[PDB]
Design a protein around this ligand. Structure first.
Ligand SMILES: CCSCCNC(=O)CCNC(=O)[C@H](O)C(C)(C)COP(=O)(O)OP(=O)(O)OC[C@H]1O[C@@H](n2cnc3c(N)ncnc32)[C@H](O)[C@@H]1O
Ligand SMILES: O=C([O-])CC(=O)C(=O)O
Ligand SMILES: O=C([O-])CC(=O)C(=O)O
Ligand code: NA
Ligand code: NA
Ligand code: NA
Lengths: 439, 435
């Protein structure tokens, strides 16, 4: 008899592809319109400030923070479906929104969550590969490699090799994207649990549960005793999914993808960028810094004690980690979302490590402004994420970037699908040497 | 002994920092405009990044510190046998802006041979790959895995002054260059990993010679191939900053990911059909054409295969370019290499490549989409490898991977010597462009 089921994700995307192609055609008619200037600063300064790439699902306002299809984080928290338990927005609902431009129904998200659970299994060769990693290989190196290795499972790579019309690129791109999303929490958990590859690598995920819940189970933090952690993980993964196109991981994914490398190879390149100290490692560094501060001033500390430690940091020529940003000039709404997560949880508010993060957030911006060397003295999301993981017993900060890697698949994979749906060309700017800028 | 490479680089760091200061004083000078086309069209034509060692002229092709390919062929040192320029001599030039002496290149070649051994875990990793794993996926992964050996990663973690970032970056770059031909050979020789993985290189021979030996084409009987390999590896080393592999390397490196992780990202981009994988795709396409049109065929048979490819919504591989608007001097250099070798000219697969080069530009012009109907270097490279016995085109881009470490690693060293920041452009959505 007849389906009761609402459109699935691929069907929902199909519904909106023609309109985006039409908008693209209209913009293309204005190809020759001048929208800005290039200065020497832009070339030597890593393209900072230069509007030079397309990204559909999110736009970062320097004053107001990230928007997803023009919606605030608070809007998304209110409107996006939640899990069968808990109160935080689901990252798979965020993926739906980023891709389609629409808020899915709870029933649509339930069906998508089932697909992600079902598609999470791995080839035996991937488990063999992971078992070959030395114990001391950095977790982000492990994650990047294992994601690239999954290109053995790429429908796009195989279809292209057999002969694929340009018009038919988006669908295998979509298929590979969902495959990767389904698999990456398991890969991440394998990086976290090298002594349990055979179990973690094969265990069936509960297809009635959400992506974050099942990630937490694979991490060994399943069960009702970890329900607050499940909600933290949902929120964290949703908040870190996309931050417009110019951030290193998103951009690298787009760049590699633009040569028609498949989504596995493309997001591997994004992960290699996340492995960079100036891009993915800050949340780890923040927690190390806070804990080092705590060791010095104690669990009972004054505002002056914190000010003094901040001044010593700056006088020493070092940055206060988790403060400032390449684009944001004002408080990061992702930071406030994570602090507000703590607001309803007395155990978190009582945690001296959280209290130190909180107090630092109240003191550091004035100190940084007085010191005068930053363009943005405000906290960014990395100021808060680590301590919340730490509170819930995820206390090995080397793996905080691995969780970032899982989240940050979301937005860049959405854009790769659109890149292919629209037929965007290879990304290939022109370079110049210093001699050419001199004369 | 004459100055070694690190010493020669140290000598030229001050002048570059001084030039950089001078350019920075002109930070506010407008040098161009951004158009809608640049945003939607993959930054095409937008002068938006620094690259010191080479600059690609749309009409004339690549220059390395203002020298042509022909200039380099004349001026760069050669091996102990053969007549083609050494890629390690090209690396020296790219890095320092100076032509090394033959004695300096000899010493550098010896360093590359000495530094080529691999940790056991890399051999173990490669042995885990299934036979179905594409060779470029293998290569990308194995290079990332070598970050276990990164001096930069370790020194950064420990405490390193910004002014000194370049030194461990240089050390890691040389380590990677020394090791990557062996990694590539392990991709080519999956049943011989334990042997190929540990065999000592000839310490008196050049980088390309030793790569050829690891590939199983060592010795005097393979001297022609050694010269092909030298030329090929030198020609593919750098193509200014905006090509996908170079750019991805710079981009990932700008977050202070070490050279192993950064060039892994470059390789992943090189693995793309529209970038380095075109070398593979050209010969797959040529061989498919050969199978269809036969041993004896007309110009119409070739035209028809071209047009059928286009009508199918597929590209003609090895034709066109993002910047070049004229014949690629790297393509010409390879065809000139073939021109003096009667055995190559007689090879029917080479003849088909050549005949195609005489027809495809007209067909691409008829079709009317490309901005450049001329061949690029990928049109010719794979057939030369085929001639010399490398007959599995799925491996072709692996050799490109070895070559293309050269230029991007040079720029990472300079990026760190100069203190260049993270690459972080601003994006916009179509709705924002519609306003
Ligand atoms: C040393 C490694 S670089 C290995 C090089 N890659 C290849 O050899 C593969 C084929 N070449 C291309 O795909 C392309 O020539 C590049 C190189 C990616 C340059 O890309 P663009 O700068 O976007 O090219 P533009 O001419 O402005 O594009 C205009 C329209 O014409 C078509 N268009 C352009 N060229 C072709 C072509 N060869 N066949 C069919 N359509 C084409 C394109 O698909 C497009 O709609
Ligand atoms: O936006 C950026 O440049 C950095 C980034 O990924 C983030 O803040 O999540
Ligand atoms: O320059 C480009 O964009 C592609 C190319 O020929 C290369 O990287 O060798
Ligand atoms: Na085994
Ligand atoms: Na036309
Ligand atoms: Na035209």
């Amino acid at each position: 008899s007849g389906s009761t089921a609402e459109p699935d994700l691929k069907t929902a995307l199909k519904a909106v592809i023609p309109a985006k192609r039409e908008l693209f055609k209209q913009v293309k008619e204005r190809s020759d319109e001048v929208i800005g200037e290039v200065k020497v600063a832009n070339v030597i300064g890593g393209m900072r400030g230069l509007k030079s790439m397309l990204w559909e699902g999110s736009v970062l306002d320097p004053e107001e923070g990230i928007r997803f299809h023009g919606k605030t984080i608070k809007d998304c928290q209110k409107e996006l479906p939640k899990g069968t338990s808990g109160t935080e927005m689901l990252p798979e609902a965020m993926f739906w929104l980023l891709l389609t431009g629409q808020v899915p129904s709870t029933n649509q998200v339930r069906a998508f969550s089932r697909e992600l659970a079902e598609q999470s299994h791995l080839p035996q060769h991937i488990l063999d590969l992971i078992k070959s990693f030395p114990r001391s290989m950095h977790p982000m190196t492990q994650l990047s490699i294992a994601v690239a290795a999954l290109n053995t499972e790429s429908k796009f790579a195989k279809a292209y090799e057999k002969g694929l019309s340009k018009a038919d690129y988006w669908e295998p791109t979509f298929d590979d994207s969902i495959s990767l999303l389904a698999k990456i929490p398991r890969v991440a958990a394998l990086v976290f649990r090298p002594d349990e590859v055979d179990q973690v690598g094969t265990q069936a995920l509960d297809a009635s549960q959400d992506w974050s819940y099942n990630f937490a189970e694979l991490l060994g933090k399943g069960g009702k005793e970890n329900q607050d952690f499940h909600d933290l993980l949902r929120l964290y993964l949703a908040l870190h999914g996309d931050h417009e196109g110019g951030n290193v991981s998103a951009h690298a994914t787009h760049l590699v993808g633009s040569a028609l490398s498949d989504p596995f190879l493309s997001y591997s390149a994004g992960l290699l960028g996340l492995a960079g100290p100036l891009h993915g490692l800050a949340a780890q560094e923040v927690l190390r810094w806070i804990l080092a501060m705590q060791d010095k001033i104690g669990t009972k500390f004054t505002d002056d004690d914190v000010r003094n430690y901040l001044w010593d940091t700056l006088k020493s020529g070092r940055v206060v980690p988790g403060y400032g940003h390449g684009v944001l000039r004002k408080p990061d709404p992702r930071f406030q979302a994570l602090m507000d997560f703590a607001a309803t949880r007395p155990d978190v508010l009582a945690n001296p490590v959280f209290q130190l993060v909180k107090k630092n957030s109240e003191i550091a911006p004035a100190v940084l402004t007085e010191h005068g060397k930053t363009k943005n003295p405000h906290p960014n999301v990395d100021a808060a994420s680590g301590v919340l993981f730490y509170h819930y017993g995820f206390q090995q900060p080397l793996y905080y970037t691995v969780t970032f890697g899982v989240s940050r698949a979301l937005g860049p994979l959405v854009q790769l699908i659109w890149d292919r749906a629209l037929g965007l060309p290879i990304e290939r700017p022109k370079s110049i040497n210093l001699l050419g800028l001199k004369k």
